């Protein structure tokens, strides 16, 4: 069984498995780091006793949530109730699945790329919809209608925000996107695309300030699945933002993984800072900002990007 083809296949499989394991542990440790960073922002310490520096708090949470009594409501649909955390985890996980972390270190070098990210987000809205329906509660139903309306109102321009980087790269591939950032990172030309993608990625992750309850009927491992899927999705959006607007793994001196991890961790810290600082806007202004402002901004940005590209092509 000694052959270079089988060795390469096993090595690529191990690389994908390593990427997935690092992502799930990074999401869980980022929930712990969200707690710690909220403590740091709010002039306190946070969890720092369970193990060295609180690093074993996540293990305690996992053990508690595994050994808690699993509950499914008596008057609820079992399949949909079980299937909502499945979507909330796996949809944005496989949205991460296209992100290139290093040259030669990728899971799938697809020809669609952030198109596949859009498929995964459109699948991810079903988690909120299914959790609202399967709870058999009208309060959670109305909350899910509101949350799904918000996520639709911002997914309506998520892809059009990514279209500026698509136009400047000329292809849907992520490797071509990070190769086109060899001189100037995409945050400089596609700045409006950058802010609109930031707002859209914040909104579709059900995070501050675009949130709300449909979580009340879940408990035990299903609530933990929703939680870790939310943080894994924040990791996914941060890494996609790094690979789309900040060159990804490209850097002058450090190894490419060091630059990619530094930019990703900076965007996670910026997520926690956004949660700590900004207040909650009301529904009407949130939907008005999603529709009236960001979508025409993305359309005008795409038009200006096309005009600049065709002007620069002699």
């Amino acid at each position: 069984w000694i052959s270079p083809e089988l060795i390469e296949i096993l090595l690529t499989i191990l690389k994908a498995v390593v990427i997935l394991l690092v992502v799930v542990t990074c999401g869980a440790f980022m929930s712990f780091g969200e707690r710690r960073l909220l403590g740091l922002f709010q002039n306190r310490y946070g969890p720092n006793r369970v193990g060295w520096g609180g690093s074993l708090q996540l293990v305690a949470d996992m053990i508690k949530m595994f050994f808690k009594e699993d509950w499914i409501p008596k008057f609820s649909d079992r399949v949909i109730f079980t299937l909502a955390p499945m979507i909330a985890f796996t949809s944005l996980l496989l949205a991460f699945a296209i992100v290139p972390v290093s040259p030669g270190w990728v899971v799938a070098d697809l020809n669609i790329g952030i198109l596949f990210f859009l498929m995964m987000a459109g699948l991810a809205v079903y988690a909120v919809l299914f959790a609202g329906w399967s709870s058999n509660n009208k309060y959670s139903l109305l909350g899910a209608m509101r949350a799904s309306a918000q996520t639709l109102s911002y997914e309506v321009f998520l892809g059009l925000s990514l279209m500026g980087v698509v136009a400047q790269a000329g292809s849907f591939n992520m490797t071509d996107i990070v190769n086109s950032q060899a001189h100037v990172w995409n945050v400089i030309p596609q700045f409006f695309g950058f802010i609109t993608f930031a707002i859209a990625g914040v909104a579709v992750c059900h995070r501050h300030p675009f949130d709300q309850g449909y979580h009340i009927e879940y408990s035990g491992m299903k609530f933990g699945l929703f939680f870790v899927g939310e943080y894994i999705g924040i990791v996914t959006i941060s890494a996609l933002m790094v690979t789309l607007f900040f060159g990804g793994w490209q850097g002058p001196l450090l190894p490419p993984f060091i630059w990619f991890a530094l930019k990703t961790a900076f965007f996670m810290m910026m997520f926690i800072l956004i949660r700590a600082s900004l207040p909650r806007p009301r529904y009407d202004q949130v939907m008005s900002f999603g529709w009236k402002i960001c979508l025409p901004l993305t359309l005008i940005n795409l038009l200006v990007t096309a005009a600049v590209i065709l002007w620069q092509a002699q």
């Binding site: 296949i9 699945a97 309506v156 698509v166 491992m221 359309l299 038009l303 065709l310």
Partner: protein, 102 residues
């Protein structure tokens, strides 16, 4: 090529391991531990606007990957497309279709 079939195997392993990992943690959560309003039409309007603008967005998705090959003629065609889309959006905004509170 060896690289492409290796990449397909890696993607298949990623999908299978992710789905099976979430299923396994669901099974473990189920296994461990002992035991003891009328909705308005504004949601429909918002979802329908999302659907229509998502199809116009898919047209723009198709255009954006081939801007250089289409030339200035494709830019003109997409300009009329985006102008019609923005006229529709302005029409929706000005009649109160996108306003939640009356």
């Amino acid at each position: 090529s060896t690289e492409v079939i290796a990449h397909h195997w890696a993607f298949a392993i990623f999908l299978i391991v992710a789905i099976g990992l979430c299923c396994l943690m669901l099974v473990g959560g189920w296994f461990l531990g002992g035991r003891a309003l009328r909705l308005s039409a504004k949601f429909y309007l918002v979802a329908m606007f999302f659907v229509i603008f998502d199809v116009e967005a898919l047209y723009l998705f198709a255009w954006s990957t081939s801007i250089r090959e289409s030339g200035w003629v494709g830019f003109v065609e997409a300009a009329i497309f985006i102008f019609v889309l923005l006229a529709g959006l302005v029409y929706l905004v000005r009649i109160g279709a996108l306003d939640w509170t009356p």
